């Protein structure tokens, strides 16, 4: 499994593979548990809000993270990710698996989805 083949999977499958430590070939670092719990508490905090309100609040952290990556069209990429992925899994890529997230964003830039 390469980084690009992995970034091509849904966030929930990338994260599922991370936790099932048969990781003899998974280009993912060991997640920090204080970070994993802060992200899960954050997502817990959004349960019960309007879908629209949940994507805006997560989008805030997500857009800031894509702008660090150096990619143009980070709003459009941010919206597309929020509409195409599991919110909780995406936040785990954002805070814990940033390089996979970047490989996934390059896949979308390749589809002209930032334009």
């Amino acid at each position: 499994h390469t980084l690009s083949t992995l970034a091509a999977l849904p966030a929930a499958e990338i994260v599922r593979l991370a936790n099932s430590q048969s990781s003899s070939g998974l280009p993912l670092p060991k997640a920090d548990p204080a970070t994993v719990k802060a992200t899960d508490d954050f997502i817990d905090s959004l349960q019960g809000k309007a879908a629209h309100d949940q994507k805006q609040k997560l989008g805030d952290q997500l857009f800031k993270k894509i702008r660090t990556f150096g990619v143009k069209g980070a709003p459009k990429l941010t919206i597309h990710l929020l509409d195409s992925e599991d919110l909780r899994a995406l936040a785990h890529l954002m805070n814990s698996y940033e390089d996979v997230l970047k490989e996934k964003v390059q896949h979308k830039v390749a589809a002209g989805l930032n334009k």
Binding site: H52, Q56, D60, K64, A74, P75, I79
Partner: peptide
């Protein structure tokens, strides 16, 4: 730059 969900 401001991020907003439509």
């Amino acid at each position: 730059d401001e991020f907003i969900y439509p």
